Design a protein around this nucleic acid. Sequence first.
DNA 1: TTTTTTGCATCGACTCAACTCAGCTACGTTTTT
DNA 2: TTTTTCGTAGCTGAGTTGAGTCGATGCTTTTTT
Lengths: 278, 255, 279, 267, 93, 93
Amino acid sequence: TWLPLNPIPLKDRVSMIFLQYGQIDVIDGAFVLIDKTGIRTHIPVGSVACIMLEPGTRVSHAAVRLAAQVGTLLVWVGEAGVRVYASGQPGGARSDKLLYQAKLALDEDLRLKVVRKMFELRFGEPAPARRSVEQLRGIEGSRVRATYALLAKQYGVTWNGRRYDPKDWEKGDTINQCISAATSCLYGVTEAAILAAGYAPAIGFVHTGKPLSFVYDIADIIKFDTVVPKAFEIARRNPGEPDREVRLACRDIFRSSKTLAKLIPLIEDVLAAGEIQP
Amino acid sequence: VSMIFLQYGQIDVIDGAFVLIDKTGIRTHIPVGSVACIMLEPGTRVSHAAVRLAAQVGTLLVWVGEAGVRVYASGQPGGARSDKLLYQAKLALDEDLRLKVVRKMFELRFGEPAPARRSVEQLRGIEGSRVRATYALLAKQYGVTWNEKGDTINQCISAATSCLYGVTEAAILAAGYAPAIGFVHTGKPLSFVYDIADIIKFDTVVPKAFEIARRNPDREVRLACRDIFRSSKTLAKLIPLIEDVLAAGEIQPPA
Amino acid sequence: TWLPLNPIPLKDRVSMIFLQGQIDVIDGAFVLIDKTGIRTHIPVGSVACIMLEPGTRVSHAAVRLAAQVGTLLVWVGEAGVRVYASGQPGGARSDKLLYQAKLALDEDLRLKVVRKMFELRFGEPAPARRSVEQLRGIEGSRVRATYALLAKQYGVTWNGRRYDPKDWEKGDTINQCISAATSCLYGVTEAAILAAGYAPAIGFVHTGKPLSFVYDIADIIKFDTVVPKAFEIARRNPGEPDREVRLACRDIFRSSKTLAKLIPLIEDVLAAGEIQPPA
Amino acid sequence: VSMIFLQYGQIDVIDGAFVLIDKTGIRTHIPVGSVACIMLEPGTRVSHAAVRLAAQVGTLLVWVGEAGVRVYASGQPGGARSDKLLYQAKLALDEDLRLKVVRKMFELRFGEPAPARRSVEQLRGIEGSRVRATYALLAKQYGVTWNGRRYDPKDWEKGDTINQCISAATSCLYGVTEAAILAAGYAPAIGFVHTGKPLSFVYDIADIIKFDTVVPKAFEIARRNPGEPDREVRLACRDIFRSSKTLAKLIPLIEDVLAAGEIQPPA
Amino acid sequence: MSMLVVVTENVPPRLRGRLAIWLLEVRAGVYVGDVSAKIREMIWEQIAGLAEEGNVVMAWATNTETGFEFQTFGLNRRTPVDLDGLRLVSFLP
Amino acid sequence: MSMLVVVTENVPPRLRGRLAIWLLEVRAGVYVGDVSAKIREMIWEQIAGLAEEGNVVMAWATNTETGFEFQTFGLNRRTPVDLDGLRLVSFLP
DNA sequence: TTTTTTGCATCGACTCAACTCAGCTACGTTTTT
DNA sequence: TTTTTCGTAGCTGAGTTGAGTCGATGCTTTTTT
C-alpha cells in the first residue's frame, strides 16, 4: 500500500532554498542532497516554494518527479543567482483559469484595464486616464528611473543606470549584480505562484512575447516594495560575497511582508480588474 | 519537430553539446542544432551544465517514463510561447471556430466527413455510438467477453489509455500547446490531451489491450504500449496531427 | 557528578493535580505506582499544588522531592476538603515575615490592611472610621447577599452555608461543591503565601487559626472565581461533583491569571500598611 | 515536648492509633494522646489515613534525616499557631527585648553574664573572640593542626580536613536545631543575633550548644583522619543526638531564651 | 500554525521518507516541523495509512493547559492516561 | 512561553529523571513540555551538566522562519548543518 | 555488428547501539552562616 | 532478651527491540474521461 502525495498551500511554506553541493537523489521517497563525501542532507521539499539549484548540482529523474508532485518549482540558476531554467507540474494549468487569462489577453480593451490595475497597485494611485498601453508603460519607465535615482541616494550608492554584461559576470556593477540576484529570487516565487494558481507565465499584459511575461508583470508590481531596496542595502556595504547576503535578505523580506501569502490574491485582483468573473 | 529519448545515464555537456554518460564513457552524442526537445526517461540524471546549455539554446526538457507512457515534469512550465497558447485559446473560446476543429478531429478519427447537421453537443452522441460499436466489434474479433474492482479487460483498456494520455501529453507539450485547453473535452486540466488521444486510440492501442486481455496484465499492457510508441514513432507523428487539427482553424498558425 | 534542584516560578506552573496507589521516587523523579505496577510519571516541578486523595502512601524521598521543587503537598479527604499540608521547612524569609508581623501587631496598620482587603474584594472603598469587627459584620452581610444572588442566578435551592464535620451526605450538593472548590482555592493560595515567604497562620481579618492569612487572601478572590462555577456545577446535580469541581477550578485559575496575580495581590494588600516592603 | 522518631517502615492507622509496620508486622504502637510531633526518618512511608489521623489531633509531622541531622519537610508549614510567631516577632523587632534575649543566649552559651556596658553589636565581637579561643584550645588538646576557621561556600575540598569535618558537624547541628525550633512551634527565620536569612534563629540556638559535644567530636574524627570524614562526622553527630536526647533538651532551652523577654509566653 | 513533533518506532522506510517530505528529522524517527491544522491532519492520515504496525506519537503546540496535545497510533509501553483533565504518560510492566 | 522538546540518547538515568521533573516523557528519551525562556535555559544546563557521554538535542517553538530552533550537546551522526540561514540535519558515514 | 546501462525500492542476514530489568550491594549524605 | 527493617541509587550481566548498512534482486508502474 501507498498513499497519494498532494502539495500543501504556498503560504505555509518556506520561500526558497539554495542547493549547491553534489547530487540530488530520492531515498525512500524523500528529496536528498548527497555530496561526494557521502554526507546525506535531507531537504523538506514539500515545505519549500522554490528549490534553487546552483552550479555543480545533478538531479535524478525521480527527484524532479517528486518535486513536481509536491508542487515545488525547481529553478536552475547561474552565477550571480540569475534565473535560467525551471521545472514543474506539466499539466499544472487549470482550464477555466487559463482561458480566463487568455481571453483577458486577446481583446485589448480588457488588456488595458488589467494594465491599469497593475499600474494602480504598483504606484498606489490611479493611472492618468485616456492614455494607452505604450504610453503608460513609458510613464512606468520614467517613474522607474526616478525610483532608482532616489534609492541610489538614500542608501548613498553610486548609480549609472541598470547595465549588465551577458557574457562575463564580474563585468557588471556591484549594485546591478545584487539587483539581478534579488529580482531572480522574486521571479522564483512569482513563477511558483502563477503556476500554482493555474495560469501561464508566458501570457502577459504589460510585458509580452517572452516566456516569463506574466511573471515580469506581477513581480514588477511588488519588486520595489520588497526586494530592490534591500538589494541596495546590501550594495552599500560592498560585501565580498553579495549573492548569499541577497538570498538571506530576500527570504527575510518575503516572510516579513507576507509576500508568498499575498502573491496569489494579487494575481486574482489584477486580473479581476479586467471584466468577466472567474 | 526533432527530439531524442535519453535513458540510463547522466546528461552533461562536452564541447558545448549534449552528451549521455555511463561508466562506459560517452553513450550518445547530441549536437545543439539537432534537438528542440529532449525526453528524459527513467534512470537519467541531469547535470547543471546540461540545463544551462538547454536554456541557452531554448531546448525543452521533458521528464517522462519509458517511451513517454507517463509525463512527470516539464521545463518551460505553462507553455513557453505566448503566440501558440493564444492561438489555441482563440481557436477554442469562440464556438464557430471550435466547431471547425471538432469536425476536423472527427474526420481524422473516423475517415468520414461530419454531417453539416452540427455544433459539438449533437455528435458527441454519435462518436459515443460509433465507439460502442467499435468496442463491441473489437471485443468480438479477439473473442473477449463484452458487456479498481473490475474485469481484467477494462483494467487493460485503462492502463493502455493511460499510457496513450502519456504520449499525447508529451506531444502536445512538444508542439508548444496547452494540455488544458480542449475543444471536444473541456474544463479539466488534460482536456486537449483527451481530444487528441481519442483520435488515434483505436488504430493501435485498444486492440492490443484486447489481445493482452485475451492472453491474460497492467504491466504488460503498459510495456506493450511502450513498444508500440517506440516502433511506430507515435509521438513523432502525433505532433503534425495536432498542428493540422489546429490549422483547420481558419486562422494562420504562428512561426 | 551533581546539580542543584531549584523551584520554578509559580506563574509558570500547572495549578493542581489530584492523586490517586503509592508515590515513590525513581532516579529523582516523582512516580505514582498502582497495585498492578503501572508507573505514572508526574512532573512535580511543573505543578504548584499536588492534592493527595485517600489510598495514597507517600515515601520519605517523595515528600523531600516535592519540597525541594517547592511544590505544596495537600492531603485531602472525601468531598475534597483540605486536611493536611507539607512543604519547604525553612520556606519563610525573615524580612517578609517580620514585615507581615509588624503589620499584624499594630492595630492601625492591621486596620488599613483589612480595609485594603475590603476594597480589593468588593471593588469600591470601605466606609471610613469604622473598625475591624464592624467591617467583618459588613463583610458577613455582603457575603450572604452574594450567596442569595448566586443561588438565584443559577437557580439552586439554598438554605445557607452549612456542612457537617463527621459524615459525607448530611450536606447539600451545593455546599459540597463549595467546600471542594474552596479547598482548591485554599490549596493554590497556601502555595502562593508560602512561596512569597509569608506565614499562613498570621492573619488580619481571620486570626488565631493556622490558615488565617490563607483565608484572608482567598476570600478576596473566592467569589470572583471559584464559587460561581461551584454553583454552575451544583446546577447540574451530578453523581460525583468533586472531580468536576476540580476541573472547573483549574480552567478558572488559568483563564483568570489567578496564580500569576496571587503573589502581587498579597504584596499590595500588605503594602497598604504604610511600611515599605523588603524588595 | 513528647515526640517519637520512626524509621524503616510504613506509618498507618489501627483502631485510631499510629502504627509503624514492616515485614514483621506491627513494629511500633503509638497512642494518639502521647505524641505532639512525629519525626519521620529515611525509609519511612506515610499512609493517607495516618496523615488524616495526625490532622485530627493536630500532630506535627516532620520529614527528617536520621536523628534529625537534616530537615526536609514539615506539616503545618510556616508555623502552626499565630501567637508563637508574634511572640517571637515582638521579641525580635523590639531592640530592648532583643538585647535581653541576646544576653540570656550569651550566658547560656558561656555560663557567665554579659557586660551591661556592651550592646548586641558590641557583644558579638566578644563571643567571636571567645570562639577563636575555643577553636584554638580544642585544636590540639586533640592534636589537629590549626590556623583558623576559613571556608568558601562555593567549593568543598579546598579547606583542610578539620574544617570540612567542622562544617559537616555544624550542618548536622543546624539540622537538629531546626527540628527543635519547628517542634517548639517557632520560626527559624526570625533571629536575634543572626538576622536576615531563613535559618537565623537556627544559627542563634545552635551555636549556644555547638561546643558542648559536636565540635569536639568533629576534631576527634579530623585527628584520626579516616577516608570519608563527612559521613563519619555525620553518623557520630547522629549517635550523639540519639544518646544525649539533644532535640529533646533543645526545646526547653529555646523556651527559656525567648522567655528571657520578660513578656509572658503562650500556652 | 504551531510546532509539531512526530516520534516513530518500527515504521516501514516509506513512512520515514514520507514524513521527511514536510518535517525535519533531528533524530532517528524523531521529526519536527511547524504546520497548519490541516497539514497536521494530513500528516496524521499519512501516519495512520503508512505506519503498518509500528507505533507513532504526534504532539503539537496548543492553547490548552499543559500547553500541547498529543495523539498515538499503534501500541507502546508508554500509554496516555487521563488524569483530572490532564493527559499524562504511564508505563506498563 | 513556548513548546519544548528534548531528545536524549545514552544519557545516565539521573538526567532522565531530572528531565522528568519538569517535562512529560512521551517516549524513551523523548520529553515534551511548555516552558519560559529561562526555564528552557535551566533545563538546558541541567542537560549539559548531566548528559555525560550521551547526546541530547533540544528544540523549541519560535518566531523565526522555520518556526522553531534547536541546539545539540554531544555527538550524533545527524548533525545540524548551516545552509543559507536555515538549520537542517545531515547524516554522515 | 553482436553496444546491458541507471536510479530506486524491496528483502533478508548482520552488526550494533541502547533501552529495560533483575539481582546484588550500599546507603540513609551535595554540608560551610 | 539476644528485635535486620525500608526506600533508593549505583553497578553488572542478560534479553530485546530497532536502527542502519550491505549485497542481491526487480523494476522503470499507484492506471480508468
